[PDB]
Amino acid sequence: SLPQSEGGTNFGYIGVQQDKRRGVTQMGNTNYITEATIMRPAEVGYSAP
Amino acid sequence: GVGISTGTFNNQTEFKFLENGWVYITANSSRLVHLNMPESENYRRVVVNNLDKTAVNGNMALDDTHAEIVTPWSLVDANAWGVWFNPGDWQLIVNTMSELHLVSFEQEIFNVVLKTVSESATQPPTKVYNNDLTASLMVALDSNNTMPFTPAAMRSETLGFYPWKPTIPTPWRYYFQWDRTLIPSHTGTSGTPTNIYHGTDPDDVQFYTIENSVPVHLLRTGDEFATGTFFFDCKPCRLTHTWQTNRALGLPPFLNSLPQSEGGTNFGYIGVQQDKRRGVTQMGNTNYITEATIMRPAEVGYSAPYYSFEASTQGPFKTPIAAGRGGAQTDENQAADGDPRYAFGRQHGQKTTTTGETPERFTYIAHQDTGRYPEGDWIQNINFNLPVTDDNVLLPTDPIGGKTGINYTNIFNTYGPLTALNNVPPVYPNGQIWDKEFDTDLKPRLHVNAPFVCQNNCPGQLFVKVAPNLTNQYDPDASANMSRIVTYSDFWWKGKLVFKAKLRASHTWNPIQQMSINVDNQFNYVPSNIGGMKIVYEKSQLAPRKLY
Amino acid sequence: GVGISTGTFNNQTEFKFLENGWVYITANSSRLVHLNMPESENYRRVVVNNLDKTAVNGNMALDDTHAEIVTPWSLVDANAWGVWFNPGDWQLIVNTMSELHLVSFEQEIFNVVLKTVSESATQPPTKVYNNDLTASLMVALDSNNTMPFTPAAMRSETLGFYPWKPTIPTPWRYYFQWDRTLIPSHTGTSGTPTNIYHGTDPDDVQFYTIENSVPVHLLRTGDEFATGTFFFDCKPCRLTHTWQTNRALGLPPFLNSLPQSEGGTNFGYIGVQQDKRRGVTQMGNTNYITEATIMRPAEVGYSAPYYSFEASTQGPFKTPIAAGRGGAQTDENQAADGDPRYAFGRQHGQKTTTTGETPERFTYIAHQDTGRYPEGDWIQNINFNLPVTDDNVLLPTDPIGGKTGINYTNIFNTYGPLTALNNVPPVYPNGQIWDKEFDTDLKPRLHVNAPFVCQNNCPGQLFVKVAPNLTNQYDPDASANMSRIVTYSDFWWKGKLVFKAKLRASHTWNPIQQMSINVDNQFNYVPSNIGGMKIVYEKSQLAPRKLY
Amino acid sequence: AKLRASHTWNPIQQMSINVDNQFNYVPSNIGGMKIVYEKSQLAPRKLY
């Protein structure tokens, strides 16, 4: 779902239920595939004390 | 010209054996590819923002907020094992060979066809499809890797895995920069935790176009496009799993008392008091030397945070894990080992007769025992006065920060200069094959999506696009609709991926793990009463290795 | 032949660096071009005459009266900076390089397609477009420059500035001679001041046709046409602006008293009586030696009449102005300095989503401070008895010829043998790039529409036209007009423009003017939620130079 | 060092002056003067 007017809240939508999407995650439990869940090849940066 | 084919279909897989047991695996792959004209001939910056779900509190992990450039170009990605091998092939490779090198990759596009739909013609009223001979298909190969690398395997959007079933590319799209804050919360946190999309850091803006970076070729029916042959350079990938954890490295303790009848409780006994034993440990206090105490040369595998999420500039994201598997008999922390989970549809494995929007799934648990079972972790006090007091030990049962469902292992990390690791195993068939390396000054010791990483140069991405087939009325000065004849293309794609592998040898008295069928199992490898069919995930590192 | 492409899309911009910092900028450009058959296959002499607006009295400046030859040919003009560089390109050029030479220019036409409409088939009833394989596209290249020069940049009618957005040529037309008198007037003026179009000086009649002057190529689908490589010869265009006006040329006067605390009104003082000072002036009378008085080697810039209109054979026209900019902070008299003003549409910069026929506009105010601020002008009497009497000075306040709104600066002209000038700065993206030189025995020292002027010979203009696709009923002897099959063509255009530039170098302690983004501004360079998009005015001569 | 090249449609961050800023780079009424910290990695790259 792509927007059909310009503007600041005219968002686009992925358009598939979060638990029925196709793709790869490192979460053996859920079928949730979201931008925060989705696998990435590695990790950029690191957290330190 | 028109009536003259420009290529040959070949989905044949060749194994050429050489001397010193080197094999030369030539995987050929061919597909018919279908492509429609773009939704619009324009580039778009679109923002997705599900406050809809994130504002709920405790639904942070459901964040989909991002920005994206939607291009009128489509991507031909064949970067997945299933494009190149059928199961029988994978059987052969996996049971019989000890390592695997990635050598070369070439591909071409041929027998291009373009048809225009149009139209309402005629009798209740029907549609009819004609050839536009003079029409063109746009092809562009980003051989310089000018453009964002987007492996389609991650979204299970590669080419189809079946040679006799046609397939499609995917609309190309790439990340555009966005700032973003999303503050964590639980069901209880109320008030409204800040959950905002700030915009775009101008210092980070990069808008790419195919047109300005890559030479574009127009292919009519009689035209053909072929790439060079690209030669890879990466490490070898091994087809053997290691089974030893720290507890099985080196010289086991001599048993002074050996069993003297067969049976299931007829144990052997070390036969020396645990505090009167000889050996080396890193425990300066006690004179206890036991199998969990005894020194080992280094550490196999590592402990990592789970399910850890970290956040930078563009929002929160999961912390990735390398190892696995680590748990005993059929019990694993599929998160502490970060065992990857693949969701895919019909084109890539699901039963092709299955109706419904729900994807097929599985969780790959590697054979290589290098992970952790944090349930078994613990931490004692310096004094090692044992049996240990509750106050002198920290268990994976004791809550941390006063949360019932959180313990120390969730934040734990034992990566260190003594850490040993293997690379990820190939995940057949939905796995990625190779992946480009990060252009960072210091690089990851591996990637978790693919075993082959190109430090050199990687094959450029291949993009296709139906050329604008205009009608007679076109006014560019007009804001109004791009007026185009409905046009689409069929073209064939052939690729050649070459490996160089090495045959295994029997080093033990006992036999080993290998694929087969099986009275179970047997029905995942044949079609059905109707036109089948299914492709099943199936491991890769079946034979044991030997760490130490 | 039919199904075989005859060219390659390339809109790629290559920057190839050589020794001693000479760079070899090869700007490639490609567009898909759309073209309909002529409105009639005939040449027409049409006259325009707006007595409706000129007879108004006080409306002399609104004259549009002229004569014109309308040709069945269309013009493919690529003469505009926006055709060749995107902002990213332009940024590089302007910020890092000091001058710019024009080297070579070639173009070709390929993958021609001709389609016939016709239409009517069937039910509600809709229209349908088929390929005419045997149909031809006429292409003619006027390499001898036989025909009137019509740079389209002046009417914002060049090719599109977006690679992925198709475009069109513009209908060709040229000026045909006409005599014309129009007497100026104001609102108060009685009677009807004479306002007539007398007709056409037979001694000055020139009727040109493509057919009789230029070789014409017929291109069917499989044909292609390429021009040679044209090599320019011109002066360099500089990418640095000069900041010095007369008031800052040479040795500043010695300060005998320097301030001794920081601050905003802690000025320094020369410390010598203005009439007891040493130096050279061009004032034979006084012994006053001041900064506005002290001699300078010559004069930077010149004063010009504004808004001056002059009239010849064919009517009135504005007197054009060279220099600019001349005023201080944020106030510049955009007419005394003749700052140019650009109007353009969607294809060339205006937001492509904007509906309505109102064009986007801007006024280019150059960085090079070489203009005038006539409010600051004045003229003293020979005697220089000052403070000056009202009788001895002529101000830009004192009315001339008894008009409240007119002063001497409106007719003033200080061009002279001591005048120093720069050439016009490039106007990205709507500015013209190169321009033909007048075939007058004596030539202008510059042009205001473009920085590069071919005194050699300029590239020929390129003309296209759909060939007459006749129906079976055709009678040339017949007065009724030609019934032709409705035909149109899509063809691809590729051009290559090569520059040779030189890298600048830092010679000052301070940094300098350079383009960037910017939390403002940042959004003129990316598409939108829908298909974008916009190209914005962006200067050209950013880094300072030095006159003297 | 090595010269950069434009890879995007958009322009990018780069140093300049600036109606602000402009007075940190010239001396003063007296003998100036000041030198100001100023970053270094202005142009975008691309990780992946």
Ligand SMILES: [Mg+2]
């Ligand atoms: Mg095991």
Ligand SMILES: [Mg+2]
């Ligand atoms: Mg200035």
